[PDB]
RNA sequence: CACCAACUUCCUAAACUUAAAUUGGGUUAAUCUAUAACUUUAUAGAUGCAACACUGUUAGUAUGAGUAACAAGAAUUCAAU
């Protein structure tokens, strides 16, 4: 499946780590059914955890519309432009309350293979090891077999 | 001897798209400065041709005409005259041949 | 059409010019033979002696025929002419740039017309001034023997009792069966051969469960070289230009051959008594009868043979 | 069925503004159900892609298969409604930008075999079709230089990294 | 086995028309409707000079009553009011709003504002076609010119002198016939008419009546070539 | 192996070679001008020289009448073989025969065709194909370099 | 500086075209009848003053694009780029005509234009070269002519084998841009104006407005290139396939002015010879050609 | 005088310890009915309830293959000579 996906390479959306942290995760959509069955754990996180997530990502504005639904549904934009949507379908607070934590703390950046655990933008500090290095000059730079 | 395997497209695409199989492009081909019309080079061109057999089915209708059955060949020589023309003294002791439409251009 | 068209020597002349262009690249073809009729005064090349291990030039000839000779003990021998033809010295290469410890001369035969050769062919002649040759062929020469393009080869450049090589394209057959290229037997006429009279029988065995590379099968026969080794010459006729080899040559009347001494171990250096740089006759040192003969030869107009 | 290559013609693009390049117009024409192998059409189709439409014209005119006066006869359909209908202003002004041959509709049969034995024949028809394009031919392409594989090359190697590291 | 050959059968003209068939005439149960008349009753011959004119006509209307004014008659024992004197301007409206249309292609509000003689005179031609008319200023107010009546219609010809802007396009936006935005004047004659019985009818644009006196127009930007006569072999030039 | 053979197989055999080839050398007297595929009429063009050749012995000779006999099959065309067609061409050496190629058979089999006819007939002439005049540029500058060579020795 | 009269001298051949183009107003439409032999009776509408002898043939087919050299309108040479003006006849000429004199004299002079632009281009800015006149010499002659006052300074040399083998090569490099033949029929005054510093164009482009009725001149330009011509040119650079630059000759009585006369020889891509007949008519070509 | 090497074992996070006829258990795709839901869902009740394979059945389309094989005597002035 490797051969058969993309790949990427392991990076961050703008340095956020560099000068300050920014959380990326920057809107909430939750759309509910007032009386459904499917979408009662989904209530229940507005009722008790929707307040309390919001005080806690003061960036991220969250926004519940119960209206005539059948299925419950969960839309993340983050500030790179991806889009994320969840089926809430018949779900509990405690799994709700789960993934909208997982959201918040994700990138944009996209899920596939990562080449390489690791990044560097400055790889070497004492020099990029090039054939020369740790070969010998010789007197006059006289190639081999040069007579002069 | 039946085949052992059934023989895949990207095989097939390579036998019969192969430049060996493929319609050559013709070089030889010109115009004819009379009709402009188009032509090989090497071979007559197939409009002028055309009106010149045309005429001359007019003319073996006529002959036929004149000898009114078979076994009539002349022994003597054959001249066509058109209307307007009358034989000369060259053209004494000659089957005629005459022919209602007036002397063709091309026809001397 | 702004396309590829297609052209010819003779599209674009009028009836007039067409008479004209050929009588006028004729003429070319005359004034630039005889100007390199004279090679020993036009700057030849230093004439080196012969010494043992030399190699010399060879001719590129024309096939006239076959006819019957007798010798003075009366046996008949059947005997092939080869006419030299405008043979010209082309290309000279070095020991080096042939790669071989010898070095390499290229001799041309039988001028032909100039109106359906590519340009680089002709361009080729143009610099070397000779109208154009049928065919190239190279012989290997020795340093001692290396002669200066330009210069024409008679046919007095080989002597009666030298044997000689002549190599050429042997008669084409096309397409063949596997009996009458290879001489298989075949199968039975009648007794219940089914479908099988000329057919090739078995491959090969069934363990290698493949067929050997070489096998000999059905396929295109002859228009091949092939080379025939220590043909005598029995005559010479200087004033054609005809050379009597002993035997058959391969090839169809009119083919053009390759003669050039023979190559066999006995004959190893038997050029020490002809013309060891090549026959000149612009040097004139002595003038050749019309026809040479091998002594053993029964020429005719001699008195009939009597073994007495 | 489907009939799409009909209604290529009938799009309509918006007044083009005054500083724009002028569009080439195109032209779509097809035949339908020609009693012949589109295999066999695939070659005469082939043969004329990118050509002139004199140039095709010239071509087909000395071909000795069916197809080739069948093709001939679409080209000149083509050609003539280009400028009575979409504002072709010259005749001569004209490229085979696309043509193919398609499958058709086809009739299952018997062949006769010779010990009471048959098979199943198939009467094949096919479909032709081209898109003409106002305009020279484009330019034929040109083979790539011993400098230019050479510089390719070259870029090659400098896309090399070192793999499997920092 | 095998399966069998059914011959399974824009479609029956072809069909009859291989095949042959007596196609005998069908008397039309209900009467075809008509709205309008192909044509004009009588087709109002311009007076010469009646352009480059940078009321004297209507007097001559005026003397025509004779022939005009007893229509004017019928036209208002169907109506009772249609008077000339207002007719001008809302002619002029239907004129221009009819024009307008053509800009959307709003082809429904035709129907409603031309004849069925003048929707085929108007659209045909222009079919995969953008089209962009402009109406400028009108040098001079309209005037009727001819009122004519004969299943009762009338026409009432009017005279209009306005000047306008055409740039009609191909599919490929590309410009065929006009300038960007460019006014000219135009002098056309056009002739209105109406169903006077229908109690659902009213005034609609009929068709327009080119004096012959009238300068050329002006031509398509690209070139055309006229083939000559096509010769088979037998024929020769003339 | 068919190197040397000068002869074309056609027909059921060789006896029906000859009849195919003697009922077209019997329409090309008759008429003079005749349409057949490029191979058979190539094929009958030797016969169609040489009969004229037998024809200029002359009436009195047997060996004439007797060859005509036996390819005319209408007995009519005798007469003009003799009386016609040999003094027309005595002053040539040879040569009788024109043969042309025309465009290919519309006939779904699309065989390659020529026309095939004796010199000097009474037919409308055939749309040959004519070389350039002297007027063009190549042959003025071949025109200019005859001049000069003529004229200077 | 050469550069300078360049962009000088073609800013003026720009202006004059966009002055005439701009002066004539609207589309008008004008009827030329096709009375050559092939498709008669055909009539093209077209917009004066813009279209060409070339749009015409466009219309026909391609056959008529790459075949026609020039056409007689209202039997009169007109260059196929040339703009028509008036309803008239018009024919097309080929080089394979019957009588291809026209077409041969049209070929003749556009050929020498060629060879003054590579020459002019050829030597080094240091030196000075200027152009004269273009010989009017019968085809007959075996090659057209190409007079030329160099500077004193190369008074003494003589072009070597590989130096006209080199002016050739720039032919054939001239060739392979396709350049058409621009053309355009202009007053005396700018003609002057293009060419005042050369004495000998000046005096030349006087007598062609002397014999004319009014001061009209024939302008044609190559690329930057740009010259006064005897008549029509030929519709495009790429017509020619065989160029030769074959022999100089300085002029004998060129005392005051050393004048050198370049000859050449070339052959159309419809008329192409084989490779020895070049020969024969390039050695020909070789010899100086007096002017009759 | 050693190195290399099978998650054998350690390490971070986890996990709790071995051909296959047969046996025990936990879920589930689809459709219908009851009652709800209202861009396609929930709890129950049901069933012709899930196919990479039976020289499976029907239909379609390939491969072999544009291959094996098939056909009209000639010319002309053409229900003709
Ligand atoms: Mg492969
Ligand atoms: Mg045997
Ligand atoms: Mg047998
Ligand atoms: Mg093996
Ligand atoms: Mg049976
Ligand atoms: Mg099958
Ligand atoms: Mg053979
Ligand atoms: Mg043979
Ligand atoms: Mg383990
Ligand atoms: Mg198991
Ligand atoms: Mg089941
Ligand atoms: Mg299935
Ligand atoms: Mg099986
Ligand atoms: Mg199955
Ligand atoms: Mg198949
Ligand atoms: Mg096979
Ligand atoms: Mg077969
Ligand atoms: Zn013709």
Known sequence: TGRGTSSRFLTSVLHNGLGRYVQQLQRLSLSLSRDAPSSRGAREFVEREVTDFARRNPGVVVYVNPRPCAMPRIVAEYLNGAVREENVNSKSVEEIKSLVQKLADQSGLDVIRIRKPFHTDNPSIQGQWHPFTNKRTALHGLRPRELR | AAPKNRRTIEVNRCRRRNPQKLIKIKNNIDICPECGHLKQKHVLCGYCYEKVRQETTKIRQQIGAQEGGPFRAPSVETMVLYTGEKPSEKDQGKRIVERNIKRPSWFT | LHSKSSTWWDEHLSEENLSFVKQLVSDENKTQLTSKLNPLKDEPWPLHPWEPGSFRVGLIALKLGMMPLWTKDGQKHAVTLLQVQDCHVLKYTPKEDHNGKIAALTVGGKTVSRFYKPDSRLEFYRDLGLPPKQIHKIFHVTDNAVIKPGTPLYAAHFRPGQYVDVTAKTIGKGFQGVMKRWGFKGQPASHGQTKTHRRPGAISTGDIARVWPGTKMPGRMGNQNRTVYGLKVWRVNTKHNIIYVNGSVPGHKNCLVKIKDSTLPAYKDSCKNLPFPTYFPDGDEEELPEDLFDESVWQPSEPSITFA | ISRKWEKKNKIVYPPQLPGEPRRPAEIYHCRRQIKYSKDKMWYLAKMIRGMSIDQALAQLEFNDKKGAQIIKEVLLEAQDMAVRDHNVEFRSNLHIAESTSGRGQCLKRIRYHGRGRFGIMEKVYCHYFVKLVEGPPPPPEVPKTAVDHAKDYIQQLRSRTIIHTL | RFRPPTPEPKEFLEYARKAGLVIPQERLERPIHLACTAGIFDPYVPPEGDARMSLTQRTERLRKNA???????????????????????????????????????????????????????????????????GFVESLEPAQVVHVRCSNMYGQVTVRLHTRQTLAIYDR??????????????????????????????????????????????????????????????????? | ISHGRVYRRLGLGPESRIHLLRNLLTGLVRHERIEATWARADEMRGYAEKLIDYGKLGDT????????????????????????????????????????????????????????????????????????????????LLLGLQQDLHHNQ | ??????????????????????????????????????????????????????????????????????????????????????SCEIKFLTFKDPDPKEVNKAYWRSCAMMLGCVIERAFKDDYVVSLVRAPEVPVIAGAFCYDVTLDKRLDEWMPTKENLRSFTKDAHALIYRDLPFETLDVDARVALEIFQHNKYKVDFIEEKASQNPERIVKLHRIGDFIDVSEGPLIPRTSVCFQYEVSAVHNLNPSQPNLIRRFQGLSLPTHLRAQFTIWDKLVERSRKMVTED
């Open chain 5, 67 to 133: 022939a005009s004014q007893l229509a004017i008659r019928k036209i208002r024992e169907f109506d009772a009011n249609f008077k000339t004197k207002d007719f001008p301007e809302k002619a002029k409206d239907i004129f221009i709003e009819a024009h307008l249309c053509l800009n959307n292609s709003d082809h429904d509000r035709l129907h409603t504002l031309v004849t069925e003689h003048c929707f085929p005179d108007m659209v045909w031609d222009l079919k995969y076609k953008t089209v962009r008319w």
């Open chain 6, 61 to 140: 000779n047997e060996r004439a009448m007797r060859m005509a006999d036996f390819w005319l099959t209408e007995k009519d065309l005798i007469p003009k073989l003799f009386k016609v067609l040999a003094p027309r061409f005595q002053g040539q050496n040879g040569n009788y025969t024109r043969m042309l190629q025309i465009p290919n058979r519309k006939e779904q089999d699309r065989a390659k065709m020529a026309v095939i006819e004796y010199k000097g007939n009474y037919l409308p002439p055939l749309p040959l194909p004519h070389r350039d005049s002297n007027l063009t540029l190549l042959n003025q």
């Open chain 7, 1 to 86: 500086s050469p550069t300078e009269l360049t962009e000088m001298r073609n800013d003026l051949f720009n202006r004059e075209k966009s002055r005439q183009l701009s002066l004539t107003p609207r589309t008008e439409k004008i009827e030329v009848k096709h009375v050559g032999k092939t498709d008669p009776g055909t009539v093209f509408v077209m917009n004066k003053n813009i279209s060409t002898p070339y749009s015409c043939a466009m219309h026909l087919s391609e056959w008529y694009c790459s075949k026609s050299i020039l056409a007689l309108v209202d039997g009169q040479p007109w260059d196929m780029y040339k703009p028509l003006t008036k």
């Open chain 5, 172 to 238: 490929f936006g590309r410009l065929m016939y006009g300038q960007e935005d460019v006014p000219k004047d135009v002098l056309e004659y056009v002739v209105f008419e109406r169903h006077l019985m229908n109690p659902y009818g009213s005034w609609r644009m009929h068709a327009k009546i080119v004096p012959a006196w009238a300068p050329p127009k002006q031509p398509i930007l690209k070139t055309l070539m006229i083939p000559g006569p096509q010769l088979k072999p037998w024929e020769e030039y003339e």
